[PDB]
């Protein structure tokens, strides 16, 4: 390795740095939370009462187990275009709260649901934050929300005094004062009704088709995790270089005993450098202390290459008795 770092067949007498050594992990343990309930995704997607886009409905998910396999593998009608997470990698993570929003969108307006975009419905009907995360789902509803002469019960606004904030609902029945007519409910000319009907048509092709859109708005906040997935819980190993998956907070290290005094509302723990140093066991409510495994530098002490061919490796940074860590044990 001394000849491999600096490119020469002959290496002169001195001390050089070749590489670093680090003990590899040996075991994996997963400890999620204690729950059973199954999440009711068959009541949001398989619903019958989708409202108008200008006034949607806001749902909540509580402590249950959500199987994300049925989301994409079963019933794969249209493309997903998930903005910030992978559907295949969705099973490992688990979150704090899940919100589901549902409304009906025109066929050409499917692409309007995007971070920061603008449009006829992207400003006055539904606005997304720029840092939005989570998948978006859209599919055809040509048989469900459609009438021969057209349905007039689905409304979208056109006029407002200002654009909407992200995740802001602004249902209101009023006339718009435009021009020089001081309308006091008279609703004359240039005093227009801001809510204009859809006017469906089943004989038309793509462009005015009934598409049903549901979105999911995840978040990753340091809190008691509530919804978690189907991975099985395992045992716990003390004083061994292993891998851990405590509540989705992955990493490698050594789990030991702790003497900290956590308050009942305290879960995580950070050091000065803003890095996790103490994690409460979710299924035991005990305190631990995460410490990374041993590491250090390696140096080679040799005389001149043409003089002799014997070396002396200096293992740095580590106590040679407690962690002796192949020239080892010679």
């Amino acid at each position: 390795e001394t000849k491999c770092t600096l490119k020469s067949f002959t290496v002169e007498k001195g001390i050089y740095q070749t590489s670093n050594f680090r003990v590899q992990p040996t075991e994996s343990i997963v400890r999620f939370p204690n729950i059973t309930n199954l999440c009711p995704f068959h009541e949001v997607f398989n619903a019958t009462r989708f409202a108008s886009v200008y006034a949607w409905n806001r749902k909540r998910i509580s402590n249950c187990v959500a199987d994300y396999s049925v989301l994409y593998n079963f019933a794969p009608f249209f493309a997903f275009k998930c903005y910030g997470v992978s559907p295949t990698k969705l099973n490992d993570l688990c979150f704090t709260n899940v919100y589901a929003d549902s409304f009906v969108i025109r066929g050409n307006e499917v692409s309007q649901i995007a971070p920061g975009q603008t449009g006829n419905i992207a400003d006055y009907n539904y606005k997304l934050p720029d840092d939005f995360t989570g998948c978006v789902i859209a599919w055809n509803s040509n048989k469900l929300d459609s009438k021969v002469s057209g349905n007039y019960n689905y409304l979208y606004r056109l006029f407002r005094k200002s654009k909407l904030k992200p995740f802001e609902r602004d249902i209101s029945t009023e006339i718009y004062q435009a021009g020089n007519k001081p309308c006091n409910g008279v609703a004359g000319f240039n005093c227009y009704f801001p809510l204009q009907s859809y006017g469906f048509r089943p004989t038309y092709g793509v462009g005015h088709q009934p598409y049903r859109v549901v979105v999911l708005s995840f978040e990753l906040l340091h809190a008691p995790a509530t919804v978690c997935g189907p991975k099985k819980s395992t045992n716990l190993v003390k004083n061994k270089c292993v891998n851990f998956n405590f509540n989705g907070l992955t990493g490698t290290g050594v789990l030991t005993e702790s003497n900290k005094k956590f308050l009942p509302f305290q879960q995580f723990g950070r050091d000065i450098a803003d890095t996790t140093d103490a994690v409460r066991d979710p299924q035991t409510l005990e305190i631990l202390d995460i410490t990374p495994c041993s590491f250090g530098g390696v140096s080679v002490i040799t005389p001149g290459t043409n003089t002799s061919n014997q070396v002396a490796v200096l293992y740095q940074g580590v106590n040679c008795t407690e962690v002796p860590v192949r020239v080892y044990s010679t």
Partner: antibody
Amino acid sequence: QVQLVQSGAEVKKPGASVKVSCKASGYPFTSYGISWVRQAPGQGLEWMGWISTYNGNTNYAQKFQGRVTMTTDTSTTTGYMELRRLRSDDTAVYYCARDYTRGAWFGESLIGGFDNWGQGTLV
Amino acid sequence: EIVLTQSPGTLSLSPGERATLSCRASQTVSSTSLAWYQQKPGQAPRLLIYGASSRATGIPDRFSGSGSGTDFTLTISRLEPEDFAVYYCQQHDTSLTFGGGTKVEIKR
């Protein structure tokens, strides 16, 4: 793979209280409500009760208000009827079914229905 | 309340040819409220189609349904003789009601 068992068949005097059981297995008893229906010879099927699982919402029919009360226990995964004020013309078979029509969490209307049935209890 | 008009009362038809079942409601209903159940003698109900024509379990070559807005009908081809069940159609939008009656007889 679904198993739905109930109590046996017996005869009750009118005006008494009949204890009806419905034990479920093969599916998680957390996201599907129970529905109690009645079949008698000579006509079709009635619709006494719908009962949620995650909470204790009641959706008893208008014809059985104040008479039918329903309980469910997740410890044994079993539902119980304590149906009192019995009559002489209501001796018929009763089926408990895993329902898919109403919301088991929030209560909205769905698409689907009674996909799992028991064998029934004759009174 | 809402009821449904039931007059496919008699089906004295041979096995094999076209079969169509018609049941109609009192009031206009949505297209997502449709269900149908079969009654073997001394047995238990189970689904045929949970929606308009969306399959539930198997449906080899016979069971079909088609909903024309408010009304809805049943399309069966190659009627094999063994089933001969009692047919029930159910709405979902307002409360819940069940089918009236439909029989197939052996034409002795």
